[PDB]
Structure 1
């Protein structure tokens, strides 16, 4: 599995801040917009993009405060990310898009799709955010850790001081062993503890047990939209998963209209790190029929 990032950097000004993005592929069709989540960046898509770039433009931004994007003095609530991603999409003058989305990038993508349904031609998704009714629906192997992340003082000490989202959650949520070269890519934006705010705010935004109420409501809303939308959907899943266990992926194959699922094999949360070639090849096979 490749560890390099062989992509020319691009930057665009968004609400007075610079955002980094990958931009490869032909420029005369519907672009494919790749949205990472926590604690990753466009690096997470590095081995998937090459499958799609021969036929389609691939745009992969680094979220505000992440990757090579600028680090404004924000609290980095979900709403902050919504504002910057909305403005990034407009700054590139994108019209219709296909979304490829994961984790908080899926909350962003689904929320954008709900608000701009005529502009979404297809959605490929994996390990995406739904409301989590109770802690029992969070995997036991990561339950105490995420509960700690959401505990006053304790969570900041873990994520801000000890860098636990990078150092603990990444290896925990990839089935295969990650290499040092890969870990160093993921570490690069967060060498300075103060810069880790997004990494801590994100798990504190997860819709778990009805809290925070604003996120639960927003995620319920995009899920009601998704369950009634005719947009083509391609859902990748692994065993045992984290946010989307096998039995749930099988239900969604039916409970989401126009949906196909792809089993990537063993996988936890960062499925892109376990089977990037199957994800990329199957997205490439699915695109032309949109």
Structure 2
């Protein structure tokens, strides 16, 4: 599936002072509804092979985060977590959702999704998460050691690596897919970022937001601490952790969430971008989880 084929399936809606593109399998319907949230440096395209296993049984939506995919670029180039959340929250209000929804989320889309869920607890039917932002990072001994990588990307070298050389798209993304993407698939990930410069700013600001304590991002830290406390104590919120083997953050997430209530786990093969290696197994697990929500 080329990018052109995927985005031809998608719609666009005005959101605040911009616009967001999104997949909607059944517009305007209040049936069982699932929202899929990508992270960095992907788009709704990440879910293209997962959704076909879920949409037979549920209305499926998948937005492109602001500045990403086919969503609008912001002239102020401000793509912090709270900026993304402002646009994504307005998107939620613009697409005629039912009262309760299931959130499926990945990477920074789980940061946004966990936070949205924490702030709209009455709307949460269930949460499916994978390679997700489940807690703050204190010591690097619990997590994959990317301390120096984060120091580097927060330095002025990050502007060169990302805005000029597209580091997250051309180096990081293929490094955490087990197979090699076809040229058409790789071009779909490149398309939102083909212009060097501030078009690529979302893929640089996202890693600079990583919730390292004492890392200068106290608003992100408070947000993650808050939803972590809720997720750790929410016995009424069904959760599905999709564990990637070998994964990247998956081993740490398994430990961090081991005492989360009302959580089931399924393991699939993959690295960080597990959707590109096990889309069928992920989609089937989501479909089965939706069935369990009726209990």
Pair in the same fold by TM > 0.5? yes
Q: Distance in 1 between matches of 2:163 and 2:127?
A: 33
Q: Decide which structure has greater helix share.
A: 1
Q: 2:164 aligns with which of 157, 161, 165?
A: 161
Secondary structure of the equivalent of 1:71? coil
The answer (yes or no) to whether the contact 2:36–2:61 under 8 Å persists in 1 is yes
CA distances 1:141-181 after superposition (whole Å, capped 9, x unpaired): x5543331122x11111111110000011011112222222
Paired with 1:64 and 1:233, the residues of 2 have a C-alpha distance of 26
TM-score, length-scaled by structure 2: 0.91
- For 1:13, the equivalent position in structure 2 comes to 14
Counterpart secondary structure, 1:210: coil
User: Of 179, 190, 193, which residue of structure 1 is paired with 2:193?
Assistant: 190
Point out the more displaced range, 210-219 or 74-83: 210-219
- Residue 61 (structure 1) aligned to one of 54, 60, 63: 63
Residue 219 (structure 2) aligns with: 214
Change in Cα spacing, 1:135 to 1:250, as seen in structure 2 (3 Å) is closer
Assess, with a 3 A threshold, how the Cα gap between structure 1 residues 62 and 100 changes in structure 2: closer, same or farther. Answer: same
Query: What are the superposed Cα offsets for residues 73-122 of structure 1, whole Å, 9 maximum, x if unpaired?
Result: 23111111110011000011323210000111001100011011110101
C-alpha contact 2:161 2:167 (8 A) present in aligned 1: yes
Partner of 1:278: 281
2:101 is the counterpart of 1:97:
yes
| Stretch of structure 1 that moved more, 2-11 or 221-230 | 2-11
Please tell me whether the aligned partners of residues 19 and 61 of structure 1 are also in contact (alpha carbons under 8 angstroms): yes
Q: Which of 255, 262, 266 matches 2:259?
A: 255
Distance 2:175 2:277 in 1: 12
Return 5+ residue gaps in structure 1 as ranges: none
| Residues 205, 215 of structure 1: 8 Å contact kept | yes
- Give the structure 2 partner of residue 288 of structure 1: 291
- Seen in structure 2, the aligned counterparts of structure 1 residues 236 and 40 have a Cα distance that, compared at 3 Å, is same
CA distance in 2, matches of 1:36, 1:170: 13
Tell me by how many angstroms 1:284 deviates.
Answer: 0.6
Question: Superposition RMSD on alpha carbons, in Å?
Answer: 1.8
Could you tell me which residue of structure 2 aligns to residue 231 of structure 1?
A: 237
Say whether the 8 Å CA contact 1:25–1:54 is kept in structure 2: no
Unaligned 5+ segments in structure 2 are: none
Secondary structure of 2:232 counterpart = helix
Provide the rounded CA distance (Å) in 2 between the counterparts of 1:207 and 1:115.
Answer: 19
Would you say 1:241 and 2:247 are equivalent positions?
Answer: yes
Q: Distance in 1 between matches of 2:221 and 2:265?
A: 25
Is residue 45 of structure 1 aligned with residue 47 of structure 2? yes
Contact 1:207–1:216 (8 Å) recurs in 2: yes
Deviation per residue, 1:37-73 (Å, 9 max, x gap) = 1000000000000001111000000011000011012
> Conserved in 1, the CA contact under 8 Å of 2:176 and 2:271?
yes
Structure 2 residue aligned with 1:76: 79
